């Protein structure tokens, strides 16, 4: 019997692109006004900085919020601001980015289904990103929410899955992870010993030899799918 | 005595930022027109694909045009388009980017100075980017123009500098490189045995032990600086 069901956030519970596009635009406009010494910055330029940081410390890849604040800092300093005002503007502009990326549209299928599942399963979140369920309508459905930045390591590494299993106190064979990414969610959870349900609403083809343990196109299929393994 | 002067392009012969920003926007606009299925894509989403390609083939960093075309390809195809239409769209959208990329405003100090220098020195270009002087009114001042994409290796590696010396048929002690970047241009050229002149119009501070052989804020200072080493 399945005791634990964990879920990926971006493109599993909502479409990721729109809220991140809006967040970028918001970050952009706030800098144009509040840091007018930085000026129109090509995507190319933040990346140059980002890549230097990742070369100096590759583990930054698992700390996406810290990484972005640091990139913003270096860009600001390098455009003329005092170390102190740069840090302070970096901090403020990031908080504007982060408020923006939380303006997501949760799929309609999500709340009704989480409510059903919570009657019978312990539920958790495992995300590489910086969407925080407490900021959304969702904190109360989940026993816990894990993110790579707090762990210092992200999916598909075993660590985040093992930590979920620890917090629930269940063995891998009693757990299912649900997500949209073939490598991060599916292969990741399976290599940690769990079952994995692939969320594929657009009906994409699967191309790895090990199959998802199930595939769905709508989250409200979860209760029937999980009952298979009861 | 000085026979060869080589010059970096971006941020030494013109401001880097504006033409590239315009290019990104033109690229953005043309794709909303001819590739409606891709839709508004977060900068973050291109970085992931870019990062993926740089993983399978790290030498992609020296092929910036080819790299962008491949990233455009994968985003279009992974947006639904067939391998055929993706590739034609990638290729076409890239040419639009590249055209916009060449709408630079050459510093007024440049042409008058190149004309003077050309009378007594061999002039060359050494760049990691995809600005092509042949597409600009500047082509006639230069004997050669090396880019990292054609050499498969970029500054600060000594290879592009050593190639320049071979094209001009002179020894390193007979050569000077002019550039804005402390590592790519200055340290790079000096480690290859050349003299290096730091283009620093904004009056930034220099913080490496080894000094640029000279520092200027206006390209028209070159004739007098070069005369020091005659
Ligand atoms: Mg996801
Ligand atoms: Mg440059």
């Amino acid at each position: 019997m399945i005791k634990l069901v964990t879920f990926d956030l971006d493109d599993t519970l909502w479409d990721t692109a729109p809220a991140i596009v809006g967040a970028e635009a918001a970050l952009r406009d706030w800098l144009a006004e509040q840091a007018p010494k930085l000026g129109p910055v090509p995507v190319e330029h933040l990346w140059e900085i980002r890549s230097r940081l990742l070369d100096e410390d590759p583990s930054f890849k698992h700390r996406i919020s810290a990484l972005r604040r640091r990139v913003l800092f270096h860009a600001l300093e390098d455009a003329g601001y005092d170390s102190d005002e740069a840090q302070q503007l970096a901090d403020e502009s990031f908080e504007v980015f982060l408020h923006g990326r939380h303006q997501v549209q949760i799929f309609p299928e999500v709340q009704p289904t989480l409510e059903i599942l919570a009657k019978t399963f312990t539920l958790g979140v495992i995300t590489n990103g910086n969407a925080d369920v407490r900021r959304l309508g969702l904190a109360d459905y989940f026993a816990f929410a894990l993110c790579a930045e707090d762990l210092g390591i992200g999916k598909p590494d075993p660590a985040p899955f093992l930590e979920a299993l620890r917090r629930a106190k269940v063995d891998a064979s009693a757990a299912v992870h649900v997500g949209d990414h073939p490598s991060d969610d599916i292969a990741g959870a399976q290599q940690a010993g769990m079952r994995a349900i692939w969320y594929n609403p657009q009906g994409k083809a699967w191309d790895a030899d090990r199959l998802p343990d199930a595939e769905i196109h709508n989250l409200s299929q979860l209760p029937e799918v999980l009952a298979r393994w009861a």
Side-chain angles (χ1 to χ4, degrees), chain A residues 1-36 38-44 46-230:
Chain A
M1 247 261 78
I2 304 303
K3 302 303 192 183
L4 172 70
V5 181
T6 59
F7 308 71
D8 150 75
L9 298 181
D10 294 289
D11 294 280
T12 299
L13 303 189
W14 56 75
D15 286 314
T16 203
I20 302 274
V21 164
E24 285 172 355
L27 203 220
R28 209 175 54 241
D29 297 343
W30 192 93
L31 290 178
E33 173 184 283
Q34 260 70 185
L38 186 53
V41 46
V43 168
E44 195 58 33
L46 303 308
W47 285 0
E48 285 291 353
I49 297 263
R50 191 170 170 154
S51 293
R52 160 167 48 269
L53 298 185
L54 286 164
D55 262 82
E56 292 174 74
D57 171 24
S59 88
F60 246 132
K61 71 196 327 298
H62 306 113
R63 305 197 300 280
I64 204 65
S65 286
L67 179 51
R68 169 154 283 153
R69 271 192 307 266
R70 183 80 169 270
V71 172
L72 288 173
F73 170 82
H74 283 112
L76 292 167
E77 253 205 2
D78 292 26
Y81 291 91
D82 299 340
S83 90
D84 285 342
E85 55 197 2
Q87 187 51 63
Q88 194 286 139
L89 284 168
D91 286 342
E92 291 195 88
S93 60
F94 178 79
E95 284 305 315
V96 168
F97 176 80
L98 192 61
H99 168 87
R101 81 82 84 243
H102 286 81
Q103 309 316 300
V104 295
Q105 197 81 35
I106 301 162
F107 300 139
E109 50 194 69
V110 172
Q111 180 285 143
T113 304
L114 291 180
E115 251 227 317
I116 289 164
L117 268 359
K119 293 176 192 157
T120 274
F121 301 99
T122 295
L123 313 181
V125 169
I126 307 174
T127 179
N128 282 1
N130 57 23
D132 180 356
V133 284
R134 289 175 297 179
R135 277 224 214 188
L136 311 163
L138 306 174
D140 294 323
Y141 295 110
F142 302 101
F144 57 83
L146 305 184
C147 70
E149 194 146 357
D150 287 333
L151 256 313
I153 178 56
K155 312 176 286 183
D157 193 87
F161 302 103
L162 293 179
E163 172 66 0
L165 297 178
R166 181 189 75 72
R167 310 264 217 116
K169 202 191 175 293
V170 306
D171 263 72
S173 67
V176 182
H177 178 63
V178 182
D180 73 279
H181 193 108
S183 168
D184 286 349
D185 297 307
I186 310 306
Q190 290 175 328
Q191 292 306 300
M194 297 170 72
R195 279 176 170 97
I197 294 170
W198 183 37
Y199 181 69
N200 183 31
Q202 302 171 58
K204 289 168 202 174
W206 183 261
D207 49 44
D209 292 350
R210 168 79 169 278
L211 299 172
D213 301 278
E215 172 187 343
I216 57 172
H217 58 261
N218 185 298
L219 226 278
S220 75
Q221 301 172 260
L222 286 176
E224 62 194 82
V225 172
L226 292 163
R228 288 170 202 174
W229 302 321

